[PDB]
Nucleic acid binder design. Sequence first.
RNA 1: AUGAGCAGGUUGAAGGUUGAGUAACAUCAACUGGAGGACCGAACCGACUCUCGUUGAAACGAUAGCGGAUGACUUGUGAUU
RNA 2: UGAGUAACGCUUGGGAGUGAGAAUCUCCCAAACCGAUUGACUAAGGUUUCCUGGACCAGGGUCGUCCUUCCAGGGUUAGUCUGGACCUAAGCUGAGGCUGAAAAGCGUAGGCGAUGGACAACAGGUUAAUAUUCCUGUACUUACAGUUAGACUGAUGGAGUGACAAAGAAGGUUUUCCACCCCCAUAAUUGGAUUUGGGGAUAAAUCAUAAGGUGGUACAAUAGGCAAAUCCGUUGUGCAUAACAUUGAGUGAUGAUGUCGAGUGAAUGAGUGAUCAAGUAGCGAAGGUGGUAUUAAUCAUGCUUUCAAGAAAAGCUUCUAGGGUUAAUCUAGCUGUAACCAGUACCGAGAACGAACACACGUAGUCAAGGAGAGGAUCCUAAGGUUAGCGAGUGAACUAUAGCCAAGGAACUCUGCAAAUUAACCCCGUAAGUUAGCGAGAAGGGGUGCUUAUGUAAAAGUAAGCCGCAGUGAAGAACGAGGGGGGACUGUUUAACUAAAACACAACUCUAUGCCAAACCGUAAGGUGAUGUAUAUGGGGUGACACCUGCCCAGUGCUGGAAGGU
Lengths: 48, 285, 119, 95
Amino acid sequence: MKRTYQPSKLKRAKTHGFLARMATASGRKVLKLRRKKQRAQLTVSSER
Amino acid sequence: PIKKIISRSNSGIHHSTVIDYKKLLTTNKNKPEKSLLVTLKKHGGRNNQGKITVRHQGGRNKRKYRIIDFKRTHYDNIEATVKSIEYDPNRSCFVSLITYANGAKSYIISPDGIKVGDKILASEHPIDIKPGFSMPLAFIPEGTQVHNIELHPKGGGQIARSAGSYARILGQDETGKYVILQLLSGETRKFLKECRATVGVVSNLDHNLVVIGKAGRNRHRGIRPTVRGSAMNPNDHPHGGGEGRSPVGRDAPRTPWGKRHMGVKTRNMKKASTNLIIRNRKGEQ
Amino acid sequence: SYINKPGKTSAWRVMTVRQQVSAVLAYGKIETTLKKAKNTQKRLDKLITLAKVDNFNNRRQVKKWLLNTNLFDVDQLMDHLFSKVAPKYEKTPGGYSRVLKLGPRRGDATEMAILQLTD
Amino acid sequence: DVTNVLLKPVLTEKVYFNQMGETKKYVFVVNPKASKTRVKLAFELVYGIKPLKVNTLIRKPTTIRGGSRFPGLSKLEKLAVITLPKGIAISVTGE
RNA sequence: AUGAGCAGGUUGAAGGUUGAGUAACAUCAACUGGAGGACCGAACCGACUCUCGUUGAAACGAUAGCGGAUGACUUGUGAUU
RNA sequence: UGAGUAACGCUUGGGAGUGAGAAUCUCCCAAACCGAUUGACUAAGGUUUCCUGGACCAGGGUCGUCCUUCCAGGGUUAGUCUGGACCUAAGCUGAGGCUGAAAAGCGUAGGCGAUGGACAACAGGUUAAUAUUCCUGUACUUACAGUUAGACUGAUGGAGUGACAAAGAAGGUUUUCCACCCCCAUAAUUGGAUUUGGGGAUAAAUCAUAAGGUGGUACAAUAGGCAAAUCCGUUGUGCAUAACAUUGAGUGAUGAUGUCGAGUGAAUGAGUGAUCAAGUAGCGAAGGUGGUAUUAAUCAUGCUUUCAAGAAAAGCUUCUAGGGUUAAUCUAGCUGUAACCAGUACCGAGAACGAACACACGUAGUCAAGGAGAGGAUCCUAAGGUUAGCGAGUGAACUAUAGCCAAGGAACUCUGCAAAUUAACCCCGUAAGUUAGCGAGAAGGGGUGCUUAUGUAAAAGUAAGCCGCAGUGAAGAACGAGGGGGGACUGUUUAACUAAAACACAACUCUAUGCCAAACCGUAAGGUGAUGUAUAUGGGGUGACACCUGCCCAGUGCUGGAAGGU
Ligand SMILES: [Mg+2]
Ligand SMILES: [Mg+2]
Ligand SMILES: [Mg+2]
Ligand SMILES: [Mg+2]
Ligand SMILES: [Mg+2]
Ligand SMILES: [Mg+2]
Ligand SMILES: [Mg+2]
Ligand SMILES: [Mg+2]
Ligand SMILES: [Mg+2]
Ligand SMILES: [Mg+2]
Ligand SMILES: [Mg+2]
Ligand SMILES: [Mg+2]
Ligand SMILES: [Mg+2]
Ligand SMILES: [Mg+2]
Ligand SMILES: [Mg+2]
Ligand SMILES: [Mg+2]
Ligand SMILES: [Mg+2]
Ligand SMILES: [Mg+2]
Ligand SMILES: [Mg+2]
Ligand SMILES: [Mg+2]
Ligand SMILES: [Mg+2]
Ligand SMILES: [Mg+2]
Ligand SMILES: [Mg+2]
Ligand SMILES: [Mg+2]
Ligand SMILES: [Mg+2]
Ligand SMILES: [Mg+2]
Ligand SMILES: [Mg+2]
Ligand SMILES: [Mg+2]
Ligand SMILES: [Mg+2]
Ligand SMILES: [Mg+2]
Ligand SMILES: [Mg+2]
Ligand SMILES: [Mg+2]
Ligand SMILES: [Mg+2]
Ligand SMILES: [Mg+2]
Ligand SMILES: [Mg+2]
Ligand SMILES: [Mg+2]
Ligand SMILES: [Mg+2]
Ligand SMILES: [Mg+2]
Ligand SMILES: [Mg+2]
Ligand SMILES: [Mg+2]
Ligand SMILES: [Mg+2]
Ligand SMILES: [Mg+2]
Ligand SMILES: [Mg+2]
Ligand SMILES: [Mg+2]
Ligand SMILES: [Mg+2]
Ligand SMILES: [Mg+2]
Ligand SMILES: [Mg+2]
Ligand SMILES: [Mg+2]
Ligand SMILES: [Mg+2]
Ligand SMILES: [Mg+2]
Ligand SMILES: [Mg+2]
Ligand SMILES: [Mg+2]
Ligand SMILES: [Mg+2]
Ligand SMILES: [Mg+2]
Ligand SMILES: [Mg+2]
């Protein structure tokens, strides 16, 4: 069946990318929290 | 006039009717002038926020807007000639590709009764009472049909622009301005002396009698299915809920957003144009 | 339970016998399961006794059983059977083949059997 | 110019297949940020014979030593395939 | 918004041409024309029934039938509420 | 504990070899399924899963010497391909600016944004793994400089083109296909063989010729195209069976003394031999004539009809402006120089993707063989590919899937649920009712095989004869009649228990709305309505078509109203 996640290299980067998060106050706050937790994968940009 | 459609497709029966478009249009082919042709973007009944605002709108076919000269004031004192009566998908009334003496081309709302080769001319002096001639309202004798009436001076035509729409002149006022105009729906208004209008009735007088025969034709025209309020849930509409087919239930019918809307007047009387209205289809003011 | 395997159909059984009998006539030994050797033995003996006259009718009868092998074709197996193998068993009253039991397989524990032409 | 865009020559079966038969093809590894024109200039300033043409390869990094206690990624390589004209064959080692 | 897809086979509308006919219309006959939310039926879309499965092959399917299949159709990519 | 129990998730036999150990690994011969696909090319995604050698801790529902697992090494070559350096659609961002307690929202100029437009390369070969990329052969395009000859050059702006819908049917040329012919191998011990089987090809580019398709052509006046115009538009005149302009599938010649080619087929070396080596290197013949009442591709962004009236910009051509005049620029030719960045492996799915699984599920497009057949339906196979990653027995009860069942034929059951009958083509015949379109493939019947002759371009058919219990002998094809309830109909709906009488629909009616319109999103700006104008828009109710829709204005709701009371 058509499952929920249909992978796309563009949609992912344009929705959860670093530039998408750095365009609104809410995204900057989310990035600040992830830096506080010291997440190695800060955003979906750093896939590898 | 109108012409019937005999489907002879054995899936229901529909006595569909369409405008002839053969004896009313010069060329049956679709050859609009390239210069005055901009494309229309279908909003789909959605505002700038992307939210549905006017329901039951969406799904029409691709159209290209034809620039129409509602003002008809730039090339005054210049004789124009009708070249072709064509079909405009953005208005029920036919549009004529007229050409001016200097070689300029334009589209105007086609008056009824004019044919190819009929001269037109607009200006701000008496001119002549001929069909298509546009002059200010001061010099038009009382009784003649006029369409494309201009509300604001130096503006463009706003009133009586649909197919088969016209208005009658009913004299003047003692003020020295506000010439009386009897419009459709039995409303009497006072239009300023300098306001400009075009004589003649708009073409396509038989747009009332066109009969759609199918859901698909109306869907392709750009109309989405309208769901009645009695079939809704008790949420999203006042007339919802119930156990079976239920009546209105309230004291009066209500809008989806919950106002009475039935028989109540919804005109803002504190408007500068109230004093220019003689009758409102029912009585005075 | 559905979408089951085709299975040991009657057509599959006949084809299995055909393949083993063609191989045992070509090489001379077959290392198979005991229950398959005990069924191929009947067809092997029947083919050998019918191929003792060497007339064209007997060739047509045998050709409904023989299959192509590596060492012989379907036409050279005919020459091998009618000129080399069958003439040897010219006065033997049946029992041209012997089936003997080897040890169990490592992955199945089924009883193997060698089928050979008894000289 | 600075000639830091010629990191290391590489010798494989493919390289030796090309490096015989009249025109020689020498494969080096270069700075991944360098362009073809920079590669030709570097060969000019450090060898002396103008390349006939240059081809470039980008080998993507991949996981190595998978399953080992600490897994590691590869290193980004840009490969350059210089081809000198007919009849000329210079040595990569010895100047 | 921009693209793509619907194997194959039938029915033969409006209209037009010709002839008869009419005082002139109307009407009738032949030919042309190829319309239909037309018909049968694959890909495709959907999910009406029996059986099986219900710690499944599968957090909704399999076999056998079944409805639509030029359209209020199906679908890819991109945007948006 | 259940319990060594259920389960192990669609595919066989044998010979030889390796190995300490083989149903499971390698090779060979068969065998069985796919064959509008399990075949081949790619988009998306996956991210080394690709090739070689080695290993059998772990993973593989068994085993394993083997793996898409692990280790080591290696593998992706572009001026022409897919995208940037070119252009825009929906939409996003958006200096100023508007709006808003703050954060922010809206939005102009600009800038991004393909799923579209413009743009120059084809054929063959080569490695274990790459190939319009490397090699060979033959080409093309865009820049810069020098040079020769000609010409006045003409854009950031104007104009034209670019530029387009759905359906349908005719043509032109190549094809598919048919017949003949050429070439290669074959001549057959099972009864007769006087034959059987296979192949018959060449591209981009250059030159010439082009069936046709599209649209009238020149001259003269001009006040219109943010200035200007010789271009466009407009108005006249002449000639208009044609001319002129543009476009155009195909054909011939080079490209080609090349390449490919059925087949023939080694050496060298490994090995005990066979065999590998390899069916590899190399060699490599013919490489054609006519028809077509059969085929698909192109011309074609061609033509006709219909209404639901069918993208933008870049680019190209042209116009002056503006710049030159003792010059610049452009055109054509020659010589030389240069052509950047990213992707290029492999899978593309009953094992590499989305489903936790080597999961019976799902995933855009392109190529589509033969026989019969309308067909891409159906059966069997071709090119090609796989061995459904637990087997061997037995043929108890019982279960699933199938097949069959004598006499009766719905007696079964809530109900003919399910199953069964019919089924393709051709020839007869076809009622009641009706909105005259339908009902209708109504109902009911008949024929189908093979041979000879006649028929045709081929048929179909016709006449005679023969065989079988049966002749679309197998596969794939509608069971029907009558009465009633509801919905007019085609459609839509509760992803995963309700597909229906429910929703919608064309149609009827009421109501609001004179445009800065009513209604609606927000707090506002702003926006939808609508680049619409009462033949228009929004909301309530009813739901083809035909005939009708009666009484009550007490209460409630709505509209209007003089004064008077609060
Ligand atoms: Mg434009
Ligand atoms: Mg509405
Ligand atoms: Mg409407
Ligand atoms: Mg309900
Ligand atoms: Mg409520
Ligand atoms: Mg209610
Ligand atoms: Mg009730
Ligand atoms: Mg069978
Ligand atoms: Mg590259
Ligand atoms: Mg239909
Ligand atoms: Mg426990
Ligand atoms: Mg236990
Ligand atoms: Mg037990
Ligand atoms: Mg048990
Ligand atoms: Mg068991
Ligand atoms: Mg299995
Ligand atoms: Mg098995
Ligand atoms: Mg098969
Ligand atoms: Mg495949
Ligand atoms: Mg891995
Ligand atoms: Mg491998
Ligand atoms: Mg290995
Ligand atoms: Mg194991
Ligand atoms: Mg090249
Ligand atoms: Mg861009
Ligand atoms: Mg694209
Ligand atoms: Mg490959
Ligand atoms: Mg013989
Ligand atoms: Mg001007
Ligand atoms: Mg590839
Ligand atoms: Mg699948
Ligand atoms: Mg998976
Ligand atoms: Mg499996
Ligand atoms: Mg696909
Ligand atoms: Mg076929
Ligand atoms: Mg099939
Ligand atoms: Mg039977
Ligand atoms: Mg029987
Ligand atoms: Mg019976
Ligand atoms: Mg009976
Ligand atoms: Mg009963
Ligand atoms: Mg009973
Ligand atoms: Mg049934
Ligand atoms: Mg009936
Ligand atoms: Mg009744
Ligand atoms: Mg219904
Ligand atoms: Mg239905
Ligand atoms: Mg459901
Ligand atoms: Mg259901
Ligand atoms: Mg407002
Ligand atoms: Mg608007
Ligand atoms: Mg109703
Ligand atoms: Mg009703
Ligand atoms: Mg009263
Ligand atoms: Mg009141």
